[PDB]
Design a protein around this nucleic acid. Sequence first.
RNA 1: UCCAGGUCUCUCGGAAA
RNA 2: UGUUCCGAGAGA
RNA 3: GGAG
Length: 462
Amino acid sequence: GEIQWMRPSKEVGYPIINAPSKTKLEPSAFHYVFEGVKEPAVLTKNDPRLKTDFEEAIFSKYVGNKITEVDEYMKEAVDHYAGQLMSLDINTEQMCLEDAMYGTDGLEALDLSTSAGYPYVAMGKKKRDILNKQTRDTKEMQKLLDTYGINLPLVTYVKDELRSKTKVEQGKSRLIEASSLNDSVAMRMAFGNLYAAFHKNPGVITGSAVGCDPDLFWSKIPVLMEEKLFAFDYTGYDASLSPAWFEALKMVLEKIGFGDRVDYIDYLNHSHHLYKNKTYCVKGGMPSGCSGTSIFNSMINNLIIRTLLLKTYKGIDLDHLKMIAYGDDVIASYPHEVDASLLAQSGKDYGLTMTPADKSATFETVTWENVTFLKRFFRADEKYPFLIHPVMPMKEIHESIRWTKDPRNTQDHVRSLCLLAWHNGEEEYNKFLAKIRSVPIGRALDLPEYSTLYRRWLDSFG
RNA sequence: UCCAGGUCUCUCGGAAA
RNA sequence: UGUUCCGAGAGA
RNA sequence: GGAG
Ligand SMILES: [Zn+2]
């Protein structure tokens, strides 16, 4: 992914967009109860704590495109992956406007509490002005689909979120591409049925974990896996992707019945963006906020691994590789050991930058003890060791409860966090609850006891 | 002075029944 | 327990 | 930037 040009919105008639310039993240009741080092991300460039140039930094992700052509290993990957997906009897029919808009089995509705993107955002129009869930009316949407059509520019925003000190300094804030309501809707008519398939079928056939509940899914995963596991991290995954990859994805899509609508895939490859007072063209790179981006980035991952395999281990039978991706996150297994430091080398030739998993500063052996998926470890229940806890480290939970975007959320916020923390076990969780309750708000809350969570976790299993 | 900040998935919560 | 609308948190 |  790489910018082709950038110039001031007003030069070509596009409006300026003003994002709010101040974060909603205040310090929380529990700010000093817990220790933590993440702070709000950098939103503007007239900002003190910046240690280097802002814009220069947020855009450095678009490093370059590297390949242009699908090679034979990519074609092989494609073939193997495509034939995997045909096993699922996936409805290849367009989804009707009503189901696209308002949901159906396997796909939730458009979010009524989010921007409608271009151009509605430059006319103070909202989704609630067009969509209505209680009548599921389509008329005004079809009318707007006639009017503006599709393939509209995306609006760029900075994600307002907690961030590492290092990254606030280096200005490594994260970018959001606001999808047009129109484009979101066209995408769901074309691929709603594929989404509903993947959402229903997380595992090793899809290689996606989208649609899973970690509390119930962590128990199915080691069954689905092979023996020796491998994993790694990606640097700038989505931006790092390049045209050949989007081409290979189209080939999979052609192969499983969605051929008449692969041009839509071109519209994620070649994209135009509104960012504040500027306007830019990007070729290569998955955009952050498009419809499907979660499904599509996983598919492309299931293609990258398979490819790098085929390149790095001649004659390798991918018929025996077991993997699950959630976008760039991945947990992968082969019956025989595979060396991530090798794949990471091949990776370069495909424009991908692969580093060792979980920030561990050298390539060593993945094992159920140190492996991670969606920021969770795997840890078997002491009583029933076939039930696997998803375990997120307190450290992460600690950072979260220190800040808030609205204090009247505090009960829910903290409740949520408990639901996560207790997998660390009764000793850590009762102590969590102690620290919480050491402040007058803490004691005001209704928090569940360790007994209740365990009892409910087990009962959820049948 | 209010509003503004994507795609999805899971879960919790509040309502209404 | 089954849905419906809304809120929130987390993950990618 | 978007309504008063
Ligand atoms: Zn262009």
